[PDB]
Amino acid sequence: PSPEILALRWKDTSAHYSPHEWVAARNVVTANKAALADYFYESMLADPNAAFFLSDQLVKTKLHASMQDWLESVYAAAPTEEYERTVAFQRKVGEVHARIDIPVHLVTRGASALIRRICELLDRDASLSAAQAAATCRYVADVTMTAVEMMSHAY
Amino acid sequence: PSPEILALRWKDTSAHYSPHEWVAARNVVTANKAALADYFYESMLADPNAAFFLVKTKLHASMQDWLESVYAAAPTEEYERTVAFQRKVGEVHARIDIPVHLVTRGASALIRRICELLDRDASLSAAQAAATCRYVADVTMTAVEMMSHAY
Ligand code: HEM
Ligand code: HEM
């Protein structure tokens, strides 16, 4: 399924939501990416299965500073109309993960932790009505699980 | 990969939400057990990828039991029950080489149609409806991961 075909799936997903949701989310996620990357990394030390794959020094440069640009790839695609660029990024990361038999259930695990944590930021952000913080959190979960689905194409 | 460990995981995820969130969802899920199984199945036909793999009767009911299972776990505290079944379901899909990325496709689809129904439900304050939709998306994904075990 080429990135022309898989673009339209990202687009049609993002189109369930207003521009206000797209940007709202994007702003919160760039505002706190490095902090959201730390929280991710720590979450999968806590998991021993996942900790096996982290030799406690590989993140120093790679995993912390990379998880950042993932968060930008994902949350900008829609407000930029740059879908096939983003979708392409996801297959690379999916293929990287699959090459080293990183079990897919742990990715879905991580997708879920981020979603709970990004919504927690949306919640604690006082510059929004709870109606808005709600609708953004929805978008967040949808696009994460859209991305993860595509990351999962390499199995 | 013990169920006792897993069961515990189900408890914590759903502990993030109020009991009112658990029963509201269950209500709407079971109020539409048929229409939801019909939606999921017809959503597979649209795509060729899944349509590859499609007796419906067995399907139509076995989705209807999964739903009943997923939203029974928290309000009844039978986590082991609900887990053990997610474990089985995945191992079936597995041996058929049903690609993982699609179990997630229809998972996301059910979530979106479930919240639509929660938007429409005026027994609920919009606050609750959002809350409930969130529960629904989290717990589905939680099921999804457990299904995705040993793939
Ligand atoms: C939502 C979930 C996840 C996202 C968004 C994510 C993101 C990324 C990205 C962007 C890269 C860089 C790959 C590249 O472009 O070259 C990467 C690499 C990697 N990720 Fe993940 N990841 C996720 C889940 C996981 C999980 C659950 C583990 C658990 C073990 C993991 C372990 C790794 C490792 C080890 C590498 C580098 C491979 C190596 O050099 O040994 N990731 N990840
Ligand atoms: C969220 C996603 C899904 C859920 C919750 C789900 C649920 C179920 C359940 C509960 C069963 C009964 C398993 C058993 O008898 O023990 C089942 C069987 C089956 N599912 Fe799924 N399913 C999902 C996705 C898919 C997808 C994407 C396909 C794509 C083709 C698929 C095809 C089947 C087939 C063919 C069987 C029956 C196998 C057989 O009896 O020969 N399912 N599913």
3-class SS letters over B23-89: HHHHHHHHHCHHHHHHHHHHHHHHCHHHHCCCCHHHHHHHHHHHHHHHCCHHHHCCHHHHHHHHHHH
Give the position, in ligand 2's atom list, of the atom nearest the Cα of B89. Answer: 13
Tell me how the structure was determined: X-ray
Look at residue A60 and give its three-state secondary structure: helix
- CB of A72 within 8 A of CB of A33? yes
- CB of A62 within 8 A of CB of A132? no
CA angle B74, B76, B82 (to 5 degrees): 65
Q: Could you give the domains of chain A?
A: 1-155 (1.10.490.10)
> Residue B45, exposed/middle/buried by CB under 10 A (0-12, 13-18, 19+)?
exposed
Record the resolution, in angstroms: 3.2
Please list, in sequence order, all residues whose beta carbon lies within 8 angstroms of the beta carbon of residue A15, skipping any fewer than 6 positions away: none
Report helix angle B19-31 to B100-120, nearest 10.
100
Please list, in sequence order, all residues whose beta carbon lies within 8 angstroms of the beta carbon of residue A104, skipping any fewer than 6 positions away: A152, A155, B100, B148, B151
Chain B residues within 8 A (CB-CB) of chain A? 13, 16, 49, 99-101, 104-105, 107-108, 111-112, 115, 126-127, 130, 133-134, 137-138, 141-142, 144-146, 148-149, 151
Amino acid at B140: T
A154 lines ligand 1 (CB under 6 A): no
How far B147 CA lies from chain A's nearest CA (Å)?
8
Q: Decide if A104 and B148 are in contact by the 8 Å CB cutoff.
A: yes
Q: What is the DSSP letter of A62?
A: I
SS3 sequence of B78-131: CHHHHHHHHHHHHHHHHHCCCCHHHHHHHHHHHHHHHHHHHHHCCCCCHHHHHH
